[PDB]
Design a protein around this ligand. Structure first.
Ligand SMILES: Cc1cc2nc3c(=O)[nH]c(=O)nc-3n(C[C@H](O)[C@H](O)[C@H](O)COP(=O)(O)O)c2cc1C
Ligand code: SF4
Ligand code: SF4
Ligand code: SF4
Ligand code: SF4
Ligand code: SF4
Ligand code: FES
Ligand code: FES
Lengths: 78, 680, 41, 439, 108, 208, 91, 214
């Protein structure tokens, strides 16, 4: 979900099932999240932030203060 | 009239011929978006939102003006229909102003909801940085209508409602092309008793409620269903209450009573619920002026005056009194040894026994099927204007000939004025008159008599003879005898057994004269004796409370739950929108508490046993919304102008909107008189 | 140009759920698994 | 039954002066009643209106006469809609007479020079559909033409040819008059119904037809001046002489007027299915600067799309050949444009004409026509992005077919033709403006 | 407020419609010159969750999240903000709010 | 191409359709209807007498190891005759899939507890009992898990008010936190956010 | 009545009677001690609402049944008619 | 800069009167008698234009007189006279020059004609002179499009114009002399100029081309 298939990481797996294995799994999750963060800063596309269906997402404030359909959708969706 | 087979949305339907594609699709549930088609107006094509795709056709068809034939396949959810609706709607949205945050119809605009439902999501209008958009000047309409024609989409709903139902020709569309403007060519006041409905009929909001200017928003509104008591129709309304405040009054849908319309006195009386209200019980001190007195002291003062009266008491019903308040007053007077009760508006002698003497026996829904109607001393467009809308519909749709007996009146349609002589109606009962042949030759004839003509000294005689004429002309499932009584409380009071006429309580010489919400001023201090403890149980008290000795407060029709019976005899129930201001209570609760203070309490404690006693006195006074038809029934007009129409009731008298309307109408009258007299 | 909402309409392409028993009955006129086998050992 | 016979003729170019329906088009003879009586007009009218309405409508159906006012709807089947028995309401023949399409001026010349043909055709067509009155709606611009028509109507009343006992046949037919004031939307059939009823403008919707509800709530037929004026020649010369000209479906004789960028402007009467180059080159001169200097032609008025030189080099000018050349014929108006003038300002002038002459009832025609006027003004100026062109095409696809009458269709068509043909002209002008504003 | 001095809030009530804790109460009447501007604009800051939906739902830039957060009160009623308190906050904090809106409007 | 429209997963559609026909064939006594919704989710609509034998089946079969039970959800729809519906969401780690098992239950009619099948139903079936009154028979201990100890009523029914019936305040006469009838300082402003125009024509006749 | 849509009309609902709403002494807010003023419960038919009201012990009443059918005909040809009073004057 | 709403101009108020001449009253009666009874509203357009045959332009008093004649309220006459373009609600001079701007007239140089007339009179478009003598307005197609550079002065067509030719015409009109209508290049009516390519032969009389059986 949400570009987790475009990033590469390892999954911490414990053996004993005690608190020490869960603590080591959590700190290893903190270690692998650093390389997911590294991949996310390494590849980031230049594009829009919201979906462009204006009936499910609020439009830009310039379009709201300039155009009519964006003002109607801003009024309705808010 | 065999039905034909139409496949709409690949779904079979059997429709009678002559119906539109929009009706044939609304028979199964799917609705086509519309701007220039109302169900009660003429069909037109000033917008093109009704373009639906029928199969094997080159062009889309306008669904609100398409007589469908045998075996058409209509595709509402096709790609061509959605592309056509998106294109036509972005054309509608090209020049419209970005006024939604400062527009009072925002949140209930049809353009916003159809832009979310059927329009596109963005604008392709790149020409707003240069050459701009269209802007037009605001037209000068009076104090009921706020006009900004920049928001208008030119659908001519207002023009069609003025030309057909309202009857005034002052509205029209001027010019050609983008410059068409939907407004009057000159600065004129669009005066009509049905002007408020145009605010309902504008789909976008170019025409706006001017009393309801910038007050609230549609999602903020709590909507409560009730009835209006200002006119005789008993029209179903919805009241906009938000945070203990009455905002506006809108029509409610019923085909039998109002048909989605509302009079101006019915609609713009919400401003009168704030001015001149009664918030404290007031007792007349021996100094000479009324002072605000707590509830227990006022109740024991009225009880002391009742015990000092010794059974010589009387009570008069009101113009705007509740049915349950009248029942509580009658039970209090009958339990205290008084057999006399009264009503402000008089009636004939002996008409209380049969219901059809005092009912509009032909249905308001049936009056649109009339063929020839005779008005005996009434002006229906100022007494009960929705009856005049029904008569206007029967005028335009059926070949109707109407004659009026009395002075010169305008009915918004043509009519033959027989004269102001009384005995001419006997000529209508003689058969020698020319309109009598039209009345006997009609398929569904009717005769309407005003209540003010029945209050006069001839009265029952004029009530008798035309009733005999009705016994000469009757059709199955049709009662042609009709009476139109302006007071909403009159029919309920005569249902529960009120002796009509304030003179019946004047001539009884009461020591304590009870009054309900009565501001007609038919009784004064000069007709009353030297000592008379006048107790006024009302809501406003502009008149009839200055002469009272114990001014008790009360709740208005939007602040209490009660029954009102309209002129046709159909009982309806109002609902409490807001709380009463101050320490005002309901009138039946006040009368029950007064009976408990006096020492002879009424048996009912809550509203349910009061409704049970209503079943005990009349079985047709509890079936709300259901009309029981009655059997057979056995010249000057006080209301002939609009300024006479504006201030009939107490709530309309206390309102500043009606005073502003009379000021604007009189200003236009002196302006027209000065421009006419400067040419002489 | 060439942008129509109905070609890219996300909300209006949602259908009611398909009755899977009746789908076979109206379309007919290695054991089945609910997904691929994942070895979590 | 009546059918158009097949043509079986290859070349439609040359004609003879004896086959001219309007022998006094240029007004070299007397326009009054004596000139018409010595010119063969008003001859055998009594027997034509005495032989019955079915024979007249069968003659019109046999000749295959189509519409001459802007539509390809054939006139005989249109006239056959009022052979139904009446329901107690009077029947009306209404001849529309506005010709407000730019380039369209033939029937004005028939008003000024051959009015008795129009009056005799009105009597013949009113006999053919059972009508007893004729309403002709002149514009207020044509004041001398309306004076000439009223003088001819007064001469026909004095001669006893119309009115009570028209041509000694016992048929009553009074030809009335109406003068509208400067509306191009008047000229549409239902708009001219609503203008004869006293309302303004505003065409009515289709399924109540003019043959059904019509003028004053009475059934009528709206016909062109040219169709009515050629009706006595069809009824007199037989059903095969009129069908011997043109092709099979498109048989007739049409007044073609050539205007703009020619050394001799032209208002000829010509056979249908003539080639365009032969029609320009035979009579009335030709394109200024030669045929190689020709940029484009508009084969109709402002309702029809433009065609360029390479398309119009081999265009046969009937209805069906022009539809095969992707443009409507409509009314006849040949606007010739050479390479010395830009097409963009002229198409913007046509769209500004449609913006000025729309009645404003329909919302796509009220709003999008002003939108297309703004976009065409920017295209004249050059201040637009390349994308707007195809988007402007989309605006045409949101106006064509979505409106009440065909003024929206007739305004979406020439921009469609301009985008289809002269798109590199728009791109070159816009690139020139971009290089002007960038540097 | 506008640079001319008129208050920005046109009583359009999208902020109260979008306020998830429903802190904002707006009551509006027509003013003497015909403007739409409010008679009552109350924000319950003990109910306000500081989510910023009102400034996104404001068509004009009337309601705004100021830079101030040192506004702890001794008394519960003093956090019931009136229209005059909000207008005084707009008068006091106008420079930093205008700088933040100038440096942040192209992101929104 | 449409990049603003979510593309469904076909390999989660075909496998779930084949498995839905499989579970309809294996249990005709309890399963009334299987449906594959938009979003590639499979729903099984069982009888109330088949709560235990269906959820056991999906627990222990070789072709369906729905051994994880993530949540038991109660929905109160007061229009229907059996107003409550109970939704068991099951996750299969072996076949990497999800299923939803839905049943209908009235407040007086008990339901079979799935605590013998999945032990997470030891607590989730309490929560619905705390919020709807759905009695789960043969439960280990069916107590009140989330609301107050003196709370009378089930709050997440649609016939229960939003602000409740009572409030709590400290009484320094009784020296304790006492219970009072509800009086709000500002009432809940009910917004009428109803769409007068229908926006989905595909859901117009989805009720029969 | 200011809208022509009817998608919010077809659903029946039950509601409770309005109670006392008063001005707050401190601020201008509206306060109500009624817990059930904001609770409207949707139903698809009146009879299911009757069953719900009798099952939960509430004292019920019905405001009014729905209108069965209003037969209306809309003809475009009546706007332009001969010897009829339904002829329009505008367009 | 036309306005589709009416303001209380001292030259356009309803205070000033407007009565039909007794010579024009029989024309009003004949125009009313052309159209059938019950539908006299169709006599509206040849009535208001008839006011332009008496007054020069159309005031609001003429609108009120037409509404009084037709026994219908004023707003129908208002909207009909506002829709059409010849009903000049503004003051208009003695000669109303109409210069066509549309494409078949624009192709042969109507812009030079418009600029020449604007230099000759010194007024903008849609505006009258100070002495109410000349009025200009850009106008759409009028017909007679064979003669492209035309103008229309007081419903008279002045065709086939040149800038020098219309300068001579305006110099004749300024000195009160009348000017003949028609094309200015020696051409009588609409025809090919120079050679009789069509209708050169004599027209055939009656009795020619008659089918058998008539
Ligand atoms: C906007 C518009 C304007 C028209 N103007 C004219 C006109 O000036 N003259 C004309 O004869 N037909 C005109 N027509 C065509 C008429 O609607 C009608 O088709 C024709 O006059 C009669 O057809 P006919 O030639 O088959 O008899 C116009 C059509 C439209 C849509
Ligand atoms: S009329 Fe409707 S679309 Fe126009 S500004 Fe008002 S709310 Fe917005
Ligand atoms: S003012 Fe309103 S009702 Fe009248 S045409 Fe305009 S949008 Fe329609
Ligand atoms: S297409 Fe335009 S010009 Fe024709 S009726 Fe529609 S609104 Fe009038
Ligand atoms: S603060 Fe903003 S969103 Fe709220 S009412 Fe005022 S202008 Fe509208
Ligand atoms: S930031 Fe505060 S006032 Fe604004 S919407 Fe959120 S909670 Fe409401
Ligand atoms: S409402 Fe049907 S086309 Fe306008
Ligand atoms: S285009 Fe100029 S008169 Fe026709």
């Amino acid at each position: 979900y949400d570009a987790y298939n475009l990033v590469n990481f390892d999954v911490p797996i414990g053996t004993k099932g005690d608190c020490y294995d869960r603590y080591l799994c959590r700190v290893e999750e903190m270690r692998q999240s650093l390389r997911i963060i590294d991949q996310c800063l390494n590849q980031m596309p230049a594009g829009e932030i919201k979906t462009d269906d204006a009936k499910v997402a609020p439009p830009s404030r310039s379009e709201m203060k300039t155009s009519m359909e964006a003002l109607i959708h801003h009024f309705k969706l808010f | 009239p065999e039905k034909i087979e139409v496949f709409v949305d690949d779904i079979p339907v059997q429709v009678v011929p002559g119906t539109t594609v929009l009706q044939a699709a609304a028979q199964i549930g799917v609705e086509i978006p519309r701007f220039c088609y109302h169900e009660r107006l003429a069909v037109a094509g000033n917008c093109r939102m009704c373009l639906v795709e029928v199969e094997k056709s080159p062009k889309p068809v306008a669904a609100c003006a398409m007589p469908v034939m045998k075996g058409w396949r209509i595709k509402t959810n096709s790609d061509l229909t959605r592309k056509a609706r998106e294109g036509v709607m972005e054309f509608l949205l090209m020049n419209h102003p970005l006024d939604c945050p400062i527009c009072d119809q925002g949140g209930e605009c049809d353009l916003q909801d159809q832009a979310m439902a059927f329009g596109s999501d963005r604008s392709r209008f790149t020409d707003i940085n240069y050459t701009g958009k269209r802007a037009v000047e605001d037209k000068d309409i009076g104090p009921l209508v706020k006009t900004i024609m920049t928001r208008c989409i030119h659908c001519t709903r207002c023009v069609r409602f003025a030309s057909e139902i309202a009857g005034v020709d002052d509205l029209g569309t001027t010019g050609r092309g983008n410059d068409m403007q939907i407004g009057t060519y000159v600065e004129k006041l669009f005066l009509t008793e049905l002007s408020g409905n145009v605010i309902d009929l504008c789909p976008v909001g170019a025409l706006t409620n001017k009393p309801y200017s910038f007050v609230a928003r549609p999602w903020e509104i709590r909507k409560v269903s009730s009835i209006d008591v200002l006119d005789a129709v008993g029209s179903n309304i919805v009241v906009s209450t938000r945070t203990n405040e009455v905002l506006r009054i809108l029509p409610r849908e019923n085909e039998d009573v109002n048909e989605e319309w509302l009079a101006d006195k019915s609609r713009f009386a919400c401003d009168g619920l704030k001015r001149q209200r009664l918030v404290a019980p007031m007792v007349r001190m021996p100094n000479g002026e009324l002072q605000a007195v707590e509830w227990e002291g006022a109740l024991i003062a009225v009880a002391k005056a009742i015990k000092a009266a010794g059974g010589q008491i009387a009570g008069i019903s009101g113009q705007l009194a509740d049915l349950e308040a009248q029942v509580a007053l009658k039970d209090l007077l009958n339990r205290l040894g008084s057999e006399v009760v009264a009503t402000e508006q008089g009636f004939i002698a002996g008409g209380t026994d049969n219901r059809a003497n005092y009912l509009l026996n032909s249905t308001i829904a049936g009056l649109e099927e009339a063929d020839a109607v005779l008005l005996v001393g009434t002006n229906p467009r100022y007494e009960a204007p929705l009856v005049n809308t029904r008569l206007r519909k029967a005028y335009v749709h059926n070949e109707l000939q109407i004659a009026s007996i009395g002075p010169k009146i305008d009915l918004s349609y043509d009519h033959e004025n027989l004269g102001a002589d009384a005995a001419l109606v006997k000529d209508v009962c003689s058969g020698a008159h020319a309109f009598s042949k039209v009345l006997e030759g009609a398929k569904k004839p009717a005769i309407i008599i005003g209540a003010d003509l029945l209050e006069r000294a001839d009265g029952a005689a004029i009530h008798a003879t035309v009733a005999e004429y009705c016994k000469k002309l009757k059709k199955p499932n049709w009662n042609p005898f009709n009476v139109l009584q302006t007071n909403a409380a009159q029919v309920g009071a005569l249902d529960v057994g009120y002796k009509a006429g304030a003179q019946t309580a004047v001539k009884a010489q009461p020591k304590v004269l009870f009054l309900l919400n009565a501001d007609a001023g038919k009784v004064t201090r000069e007709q009353l004796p030297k000592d008379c403890f006048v107790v006024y149980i009302g809501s406003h008290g502009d008149n009839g409370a200055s002469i009272a000795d114990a001014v008790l407060p009360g709740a208005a029709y939007t602040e209490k739950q009660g029954i009102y019976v309209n002129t046709e005899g159909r009982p309806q129930q109002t609902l409490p929108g807001v709380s009463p201001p101050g320490m005002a209570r309901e009138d039946w609760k006040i009368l029950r508490a007064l009976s408990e203070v006096v020492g002879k309490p009424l048996p009912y404690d809550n509203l349910d046993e009061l409704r049970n006693r209503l079943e005990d006195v009349a079985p047709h006074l509890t079936r709300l919304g259901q009309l029981e038809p009655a059997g057979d029934a056995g010249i000057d007009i006080k209301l002939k102008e609009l300024r006479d129409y504006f201030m009939t009731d107490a709530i309309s008298r206390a309102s500043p909107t009606m005073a502003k309307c009379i000021s604007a109408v009189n200003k236009q009258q002196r302006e027209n008189e000065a421009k006419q007299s400067v040419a002489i | 140009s060439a942008n129509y909402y109905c070609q890219r309409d996300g909300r209006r392409e949602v259908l009611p759920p398909i009755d899977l028993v009746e789908q076979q009955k109206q379309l007919a006129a290695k054991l089945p698994t609910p997904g691929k086998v994942y070895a979590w050992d | 039954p009546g059918t158009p016979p097949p043509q079986t003729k290859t070349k439609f170019g040359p004609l003879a002066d004896e086959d001219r329906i309007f022998t006094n088009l240029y007004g070299r003879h007397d326009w009054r009643l004596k000139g018409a009586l010595k010119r063969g007009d008003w001859y055998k009218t009594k027997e034509i209106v005495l032989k019955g309405a079915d024979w007249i409508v069968n003659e019109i159906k046999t000749s295959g006469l189509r519409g001459r006012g802007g539509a390809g709807f054939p006139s005989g089947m249109k006239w056959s809609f009022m052979n139904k028995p009446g329901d107690g309401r009077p029947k009306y023949l209404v001849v529309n007479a506005d010709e407000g399409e730019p380039g369209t001026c033939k029937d004005r010349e028939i008003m000024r020079h051959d009015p008795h043909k129009l009056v005799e055709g009105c009597l013949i067509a009113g006999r053919a559909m059972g009508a007893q009155a004729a309403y002709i709606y002149i514009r207020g611009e044509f004041y001398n033409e309306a004076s000439n028509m009223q003088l001819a109507i007064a001469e026909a009343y004095q001669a006893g040819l119309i009115g009570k006992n028209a041509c000694g046949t016992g048929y009553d037919f009074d030809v009335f008059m109406h003068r509208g004031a400067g509306a191009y939307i008047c000229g549409e059939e239902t708009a001219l119904i609503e203008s004869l009823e006293g309302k303004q403008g505003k065409p009515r919707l289709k399924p109540p037809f003019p043959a059904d509800v019509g003028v004053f709530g009475c059934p009528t037929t709206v016909t062109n001046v040219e169709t009515v004026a050629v009706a006595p020649t069809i009824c007199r010369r037989g059903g095969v002489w009129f069908a011997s000209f043109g092709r099979t479906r498109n048989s007739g004789t049409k007044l073609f007027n050539i205007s703009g960028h020619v050394n001799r402007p032209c208002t000829v009467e010509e056979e249908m299915s003539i080639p365009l180059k032969e029609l320009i080159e035979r009579h009335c001169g030709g394109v200024t600067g030669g045929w190689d200097n020709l940029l484009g032609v508009i084969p109709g008025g402002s309702s029809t799309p433009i065609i360029p030189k390479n398309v119009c080099d081999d265009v046969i000018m009937d209805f069906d050949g022009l539809i095969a050349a992707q443009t409507s014929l409509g009314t006849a108006a040949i606007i010739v444009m050479d390479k010395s003038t830009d097409v963009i300002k002229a198409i913007a002038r046509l769209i500004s004409f449609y913006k000025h002459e729309s009645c404003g009832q329909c919302t796509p025609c009220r709003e999008g026509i002003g939108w297309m006027n703004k976009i065409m003004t920017r295209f004249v100026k050059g201040d637009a992005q390349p994308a707007e062109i195809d988007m402007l095409w989309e605006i045409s696809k949101q106006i064509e077919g979505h409106t009440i009458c065909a003024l929206g269709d007739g305004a979406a068509w020439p921009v469609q033709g301009l985008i289809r043909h002269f798109r590199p002209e728009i791109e070159k002008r816009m690139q020139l403006h971009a290089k002007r504003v960038s540097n | 407020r506008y640079p001319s001095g008129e208050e920005r809030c046109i009583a359009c009530k999208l902020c109260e419609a979008i306020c998830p804790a429903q802190a904002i109460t707006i009551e509006a009447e027509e003013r003497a010159d015909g403007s739409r501007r409010t008679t009552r604009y109350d924000i319950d800051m003990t109910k306000c969750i500081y989510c910023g939906f009102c400034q996104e739902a404001c068509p004009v830039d009337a309601i705004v999240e100021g830079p101030n957060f040192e506004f702890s009160t001794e008394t519960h009623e003093e956090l019931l903000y009136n229209k005059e308190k909000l207008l005084c906050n707009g008068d006091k904090w106008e420079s930093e709010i205008a700088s933040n809106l100038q440096a942040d409007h192209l992101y929104r | 191409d449409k990049p603003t429209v979510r593309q469904p997963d076909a390999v989660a559609r075909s496998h779930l359709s084949d498995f839905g026909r499989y579970v309809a064939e294996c249990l005709p006594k309890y399963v009334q209807k299987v449906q594959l919704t938009a979003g590639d989710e499979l729903e099984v609509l069982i009888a109330p007498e088949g709560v235990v034998p269906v959820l056991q089946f999906l627990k222990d079969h070789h072709q369906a190891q729905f051994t994880n039970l993530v949540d038991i959800a109660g929905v109160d729809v007061p229009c229907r005759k059996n107003r409550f519906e109970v939704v068991y969401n099951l996750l299969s780690l072996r076949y990497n899939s999800r299923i939803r098992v839905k049943t209908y239950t009235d407040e007086l009619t008990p339901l079979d507890s799935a605590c013998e099948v999945h032990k997470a139903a030891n607590w989730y079936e309490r929560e619905i009992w705390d919020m709807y009154g759905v009695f789960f028979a043969n439960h280990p201990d069916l107590r009140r898990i989330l609301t107050d100890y003196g709370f009378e009523g089930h709050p997440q029914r649609r016939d229960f008010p939003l602000s409740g019936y009572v409030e709590l305040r400290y009484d320094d006469e009784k020296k304790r936190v006492v219970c009072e009838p509800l009086e709000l300082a500002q009432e809940f402003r009910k917004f009428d956010l109803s769409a007068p125009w229908e926006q989905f024509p595909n859901f117009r006749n989805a009720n029969p | 009545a200011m809208q022509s849509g009817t998608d919010n009309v077809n659903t029946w609902q039950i509601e409770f009677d309005n109670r006392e709403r008063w001005e707050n002494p401190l601020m201008g807010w509206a306060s109500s001690g009624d817990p059930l003023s904001n609770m409207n419960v949707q139903f698809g038919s009146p009879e299911e609402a009757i069953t719900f009201c009798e099952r939960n012990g509430w004292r019920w009443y019905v405001d009014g049944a729905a209108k069965p059918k209003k037969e209306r005909v809309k003809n475009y040809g009546i706007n332009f008619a001969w010897n009829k009073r339904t002829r329009v004057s505008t367009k | 800069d036309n306005l589709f709403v009416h303001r209380d101009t001292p030259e356009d108020n309803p205070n000033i009167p407007f009565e039909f001449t007794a010579e024009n009253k029989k024309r009003v009666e004949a125009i009313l008698s052309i159209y059938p009874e019950g539908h006299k509203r169709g006599a509206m357009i040849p009535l208001l234009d008839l006011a332009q045959r008496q007054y020069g332009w159309l005031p609001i008093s003429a609108m009120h007189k037409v509404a009084e004649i037709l026994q219908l309220p004023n707003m129908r006459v208002y909207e009909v006279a506002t829709f059409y373009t010849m009903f000049m609600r503004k003051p208009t001079g003695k000669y109303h020059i109409q210069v066509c701007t549309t494409t078949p007239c624009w192709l042969r140089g109507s812009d030079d004609i418009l600029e020449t007339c604007k230099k000759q009179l010194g007024i903008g478009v849609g505006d009258t002179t100070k002495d109410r003598k000349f009025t200009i307005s850009e106008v759409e197609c009028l017909g007679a499009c064979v003669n492209a550079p035309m103008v229309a002065i007081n419903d008279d067509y002045y065709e086939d114009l040149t800038s020098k030719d219309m300068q001579d015409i305006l110099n004749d009109l300024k000195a009160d002399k009348i000017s003949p209508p028609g094309p200015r290049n020696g051409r009588f009516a609409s025809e090919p100029k120079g050679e009789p390519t069509s209708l050169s032969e004599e027209p055939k009389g009656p009795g020619f081309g008659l089918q058998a059986g008539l």
